[PDB]
Amino acid sequence: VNPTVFFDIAVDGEPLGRVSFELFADKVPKTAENFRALSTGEKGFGYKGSCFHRIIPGFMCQGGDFTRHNGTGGKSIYGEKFEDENFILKHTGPGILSMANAGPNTNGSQFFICTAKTEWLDGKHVVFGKVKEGMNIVEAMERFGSRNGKTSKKITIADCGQLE
Amino acid sequence: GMTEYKLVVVGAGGVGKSALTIQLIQNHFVDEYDPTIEDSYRKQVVIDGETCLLDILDTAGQEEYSAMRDQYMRTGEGFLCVFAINNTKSFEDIHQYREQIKRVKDSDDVPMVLVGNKCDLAARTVESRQAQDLARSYGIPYIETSAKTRQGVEDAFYTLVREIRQH
Ligand SMILES: CCn1c(-c2cc(N3CCN(C4CC4)CC3)cnc2[C@H](C)OC)c2c3cc(ccc31)-c1csc(n1)C[C@H](NC(=O)[C@H]1[C@@H]3COC[C@@H]31)C(=O)N1CCC[C@H](N1)C(=O)OCC(C)(C)C2
Ligand SMILES: Nc1nc2c(ncn2[C@@H]2O[C@H](COP(=O)(O)OP(=O)(O)NP(=O)(O)O)[C@@H](O)[C@H]2O)c(=O)[nH]1
Ligand SMILES: [Mg+2]
């Protein structure tokens, strides 16, 4: 049974809503487990309180830098970065959850949620989950993005964790 | 009103385009790696006795999106073509940038400066002579810079303005 995690999203501190994700532990267990543990915070660090620093309408919402809160940071539960587990899954459309990176084998904690098909990222970013409920929250987050990704309001993961 | 110059900083990923620009604008060396999507900056400066306004476009060094560069090459007036002196591939990538600029602007005579960045670093793999020869073959200036120490940073941007003024 693939795990499910949730983010409660806030905009300038006010509740927006909950997005939940299925994590494809059956295909990318190491990558799924990293995101799961970062969502519960059980290693003593993780996504709670961090922001979506880059939102580009028509493409994706990107977040996960909980160490520097500036888009350059984040870390995995395995060390600062870990290798690309596999590229079996593709960026097939809205709702795909995939790892951000700085080149080959540089997965940390940053991730992105597609709001469109982004096929040119296949084979370069590890897809490891998908939005289960609350895709319209991700669509609503796009309202605060821009062409270069700078956000017009502070979009935060006010709470996060794992669902039964 | 002061004249505005539309400068565009191009070159392979990681060569220090953003570090150079932020050093010029903000007097700060960015140590972290924040790969750029696209950013714009403004700064007024005095060059050869005349105040002017630099509009600087800091571009992405992402090879995947090479076709998306046409739009900003059309609007830019002058180009810093940046490589890093410890990255031979970034130096080899210069030809493709210059050719794209020439093609997009349909001109063999586009204001442009060749910039060899990271000159503070010891393990150089591109000798100054190689880059000087390349710049000579293009008919453009070559300036070595360090966004870390500020060496040549003002010189690179101001020289590009001079190239525009003399075009
Ligand atoms: C050329 C402009 N331009 C575009 C783009 C492109 C396109 N077309 C149109 C044509 N289409 C063809 C029909 C198919 C292709 C795309 C249109 N309009 C645009 C934008 C809006 O014009 C401003 C992009 C894009 C992306 C980058 C740089 C420039 C870009 C870029 C820089 S860094 C990176 N990409 C990877 C990044 N790395 C880090 O953040 C590292 C930080 C440090 O270490 C951890 C952390 C990362 O993992 N992701 C996670 C994945 C999505 C990705 N960011 C991102 O933001 O993509 C943005 C975008 C818009 C999807 C692509
Ligand atoms: N030692 C040294 N490091 C530099 C210099 N310029 C940039 N760097 C470092 O090199 C890395 C990449 O710099 P950055 O300015 O982001 O390069 P970029 O060309 O803008 N990258 P991108 O194309 O992805 O936007 C950073 O770690 C930065 O600190 C320099 O002159 N000297
Ligand atoms: Mg940059």
Residue numbers in the entry:
A (entry chain D): 2 to 165
B (entry chain A): 0 to 166
Publication excerpt:
RAS family genes encode small GTPase proteins that regulate cell proliferation in response to growth factor stimuli. Here we describe RMC-7977, a reversible, tri-complex RAS inhibitor with broad-spectrum activity for the active state of both mutant and wild-type KRAS, NRAS and HRAS variants (a RAS(ON) multi-selective inhibitor). The binary CYPA–compound complex then binds to active RAS (with dissociation constant Kd2) to form a tri-complex structure in which CYPA sterically occludes RAS–effector interactions. Although neither RMC-7977 nor CYPA alone exhibited any measurable binding to GMPPNP–KRAS, RMC-7977 makes multiple π–π and hydrophobic contacts with RAS in the switch I (SWI) and SWII region once the tri-complex is formed.
